[PDB]
Design a protein around this nucleic acid. Structure first.
Lengths: 131, 141, 38, 94, 136, 176
RNA sequence: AGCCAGGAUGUUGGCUUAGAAGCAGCCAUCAUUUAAAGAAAGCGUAAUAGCUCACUGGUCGAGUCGGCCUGCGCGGAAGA
């Protein structure tokens, strides 16, 4: 694999939509077969298309260096694999509830399906979302 | 569905039932006979096109009951009935026989997307373009 | 085993070991690749 | 920008050249224009890395000696017959 | 089997192999096989190294042969006493000095040309090395 | 080096004595004593064990990496113990243990009886299975190799004494 | 490098249809899902299956990797 410059174009593409999103969610696949790609990744094409970056670069200094730009509570995610997810279609949409109803959908391990921002807190399955 | 222990991908040339010369003992290896194979598939022959080489994923269970979900016929034979040519690749780097339009193929590629793993319909028609010129076919535009 | 005076790695599983001053090739997959000299 | 740190030669001849070349320092000379030719002495390993680039023989070089900035160009090179090393480089003063 | 046509003389002196070579650079092609050792390359050795080299890459590419034997070598038959004139010419060798480019290759990738010069070097008696065409 | 710079932690209850270059480790499973080469530098001085290259010897880092792994096995062995699982593949391949002697029927014309060393306990819950336990990883590895050397796994049908965690490549007769 | 995963969709890709299904060989040497996956490197199938590897996730924690010029060394090195 090439230099740091092509490792920063993934940081540029990640941060390019951080400052405009509303919600952030966490999902993990340490047992994830490509049937999760069949279900979870094609679930992004139901809403908007391709650009829902579900990238996984959550090293202690790889995805943390792109954190101080906006929503600075993502700096200490560290281990327990994190796939970032942003919610552009609709202010305070239901992608966090899309994973909350996916607990019976091949999602035994999802980094405790925590969720990350809006209350600036921890794990709580929210229900006060606009319909 | 379950993890693979006894089920495989089969049904070469579904125009005629029981592909015993082409496929043969592949489903007969684990636990499945050919007599009941046509019984469950008989509700799926005349509901779709007859004479098309459509594959099906034979699903094998441990309780003598077997189910099936038919998939879309490949781009290997869907370009034969669309362009009107009963041929194939042969040598793709030396001859180009097909003259098929992109609009002529995407009108049946929207039927392909009901089983294909895509997001947008037109985002997956370029995948059949990758099989198009692999056989000696040009997509006019 | 081959006692060829010029031994090399014949696959990805071939490993060079200098046992007791004698350079040997040890392969986990293919026993044919096992050889020693040089 | 190829800057070469070089020194002025004090000795010359067959024995003198082979002696200093064995010390990882092959000789050269800067000539051209109207001044006297300057027999120069320079390190081998420094130029050996710079001469591997295609632009080394096409751009104007700046060989520094005694604090003097000399705009010079590479005219010819005497490579070793079978070793990856240089023996003498003709430098034209341009 | 390289051999000159209608030379001036049938037999010539043994001579000595001293000094350095002249064709020390890759002129025609882009990759070369520079000889490091000092010896004589026979007509068989040059042709044997050629077959193992033009088959190594492909039927494609252009290969240059910078060396030609141009020297007869005599050899006395078995059970013949010394003297009685010079022996009869048997083969043709080429004097090679350290630094002589033996072959030149162009039109192939550098990795593919590396393997061809490795296979050709095994047929040659003297040690050779891989060289490239340097600018100027 | 990288192994030598990783200290092994000694648990509570098991004591390690530093008798110069001789190290004895006592535990509930047993007691293992071992002397090391002079190239290592062993200092307990903690609740763990650290290693380093003693001065003068050039290969001290390579020796300390070996001594770290040996004392790591001497800690696990006296606290948990090592266990090797075997398997007797073949028709009529029975196994029985009489106190400390293992009787094997491997198709020979005479019964073979292997004598276990001191501190080595072997059990046979199945006639085609041998489980053996001990405190030293090196000693029971030789015992498992000795039992395997009687009848090695056949490369045609897998017949012979094999490990439970061993794979066997099987070839054919090329015509029938 | 190890410790825990993916290693996909079309796609039986066509060719003599005996089947060459990522893996005898002829060829394009694709596109999507994308944390990533080559219509494919090995073993393994008549052909499927399967075990993995590339590439990508996490832990980990620092140097590691591949060539060049050389000093001294090893093998090649068997006789009455």
């Amino acid at each position: 694999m090439a230099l740091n410059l092509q490792d920063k174009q993934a940081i540029v593409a990640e941060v390019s939509e951080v400052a405009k999103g509303a919600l952030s969610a966490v999902v993990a696949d340490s047992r994830g077969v490509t049937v999760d790609k069949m279900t979870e990744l094609r679930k992004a094409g139901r809403e908007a298309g391709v650009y829902m970056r579900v990238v996984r670069n959550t090293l202690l200094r790889r995805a943390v260096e792109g954190t101080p730009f906006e929503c600075l509570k993502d700096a200490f995610v560290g281990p327990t694999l994190i796939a970032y997810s942003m919610e552009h279609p609709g202010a305070a949409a239901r992608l966090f509830k899309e994973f909350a109803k996916a607990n019976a959908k091949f999602e035994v391990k999802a980094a405790a399906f925590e969720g990350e921002l809006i209350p600036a807190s921890q794990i709580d399955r929210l229900a006060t979302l606009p319909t | 569905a379950k993890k693979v222990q006894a089920y495989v991908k089969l049904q070469v040339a579904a125009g005629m039932a029981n592909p015993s010369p082409p496929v043969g003992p592949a489903l007969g290896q684990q636990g499945v006979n050919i007599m009941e194979f046509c019984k469950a598939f008989n509700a799926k022959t005349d509901s779709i096109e007859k004479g098309l080489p459509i594959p099906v994923v034979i699903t094998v269970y441990a309780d003598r009951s077997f189910t099936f979900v038919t998939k879309t016929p490949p781009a290997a034979v869907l370009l034969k009935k669309a362009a009107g040519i009963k041929s194939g690749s042969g040598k793709p780097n030396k001859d180009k026989v097909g003259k098929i339009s992109r609009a002529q193929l995407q009108e049946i590629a929207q039927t392909k997307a009901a089983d294909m793993t895509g997001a947008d319909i037109e985002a997956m028609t370029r995948s059949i373009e990758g099989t198009a010129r692999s056989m000696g076919l040009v997509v006019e535009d | 085993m081959k006692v060829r005076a010029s031994v090399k790695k014949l696959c990805r599983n071939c490993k060079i070991v200098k046992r007791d001053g004698v350079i040997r090739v040890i392969c986990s997959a293919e026993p044919k690749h096992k050889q020693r000299q040089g | 920008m190829f800057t070469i740190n070089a020194e002025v030669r004090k000795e010359q001849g067959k024995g003198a050249s082979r002696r200093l070349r064995a010390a990882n320092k092959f000789p050269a000379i800067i000539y051209g224009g109207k001044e006297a030719p300057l027999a120069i002495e320079l390190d081998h390993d420094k130029v050996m890395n710079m001469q591997a680039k295609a632009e080394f023989y096409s751009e104007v070089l700046t060989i520094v000696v005694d604090g003097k900035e000399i705009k010079v160009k590479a005219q010819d090179v005497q490579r070793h017959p079978y070793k990856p090393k240089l023996q003498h480089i003709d430098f034209v003063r341009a | 089997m390289l051999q000159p046509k209608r030379t001036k003389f049938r037999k010539m002196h043994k001579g000595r192999n001293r000094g350095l070579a002249q064709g020390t650079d890759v002129s025609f092609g882009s990759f070369g096989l520079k000889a490091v050792g000092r010896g004589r390359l026979t007509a068989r050795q040059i042709e044997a190294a050629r077959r193992a080299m033009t088959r190594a890459v492909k039927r494609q590419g252009k290969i240059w042969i910078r060396v030609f034997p141009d020297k007869p070598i005599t050899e006395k038959p078995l059970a013949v006493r010394m003297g009685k004139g010079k022996g009869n010419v048997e083969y043709w060798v080429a004097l090679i000095q350290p630094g002589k480019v033996l072959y030149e290759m162009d039109g192939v990738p550098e990795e593919l040309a590396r393997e061809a010069f490795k296979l050709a070097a095994a047929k040659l008696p003297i040690k050779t090395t891989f060289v490239t065409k340097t600018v100027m | 080096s990288r192994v030598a710079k990783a200290p092994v932690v000694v648990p509570a209850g098991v004591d390690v004595k530093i008798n110069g270059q001789v190290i004895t480790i006592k535990g509930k499973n047993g007691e293992l004593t071992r002397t090391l080469n002079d190239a290592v530098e062993v200092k307990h001085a903690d609740n763990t064990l650290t290693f380093g290259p003693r001065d003068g010897y050039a290969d001290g880092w390579a020796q300390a990496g070996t001594a770290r792994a040996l004392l790591n096995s001497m800690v696990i062995g006296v606290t948990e113990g090592f266990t090797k699982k075997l398997q007797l593949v073949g028709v009529g391949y029975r196994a029985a243990v009489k106190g400390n002697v293992i009787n094997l029927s491997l198709g020979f014309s005479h019964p073979v009886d292997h004598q276990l060393p001191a501190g080595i306990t072997a059990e046979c819950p199945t006639q085609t299975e041998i489980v053996l336990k001990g405190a030293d990883k090196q000693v029971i590895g030789q015992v498992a190799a000795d039992l395997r050397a009687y009848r090695r796994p056949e490369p045609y049908k897998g017949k012979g004494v094999r490990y439970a965690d061993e794979v066997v490549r099987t070839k054919e007769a090329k015509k029938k």
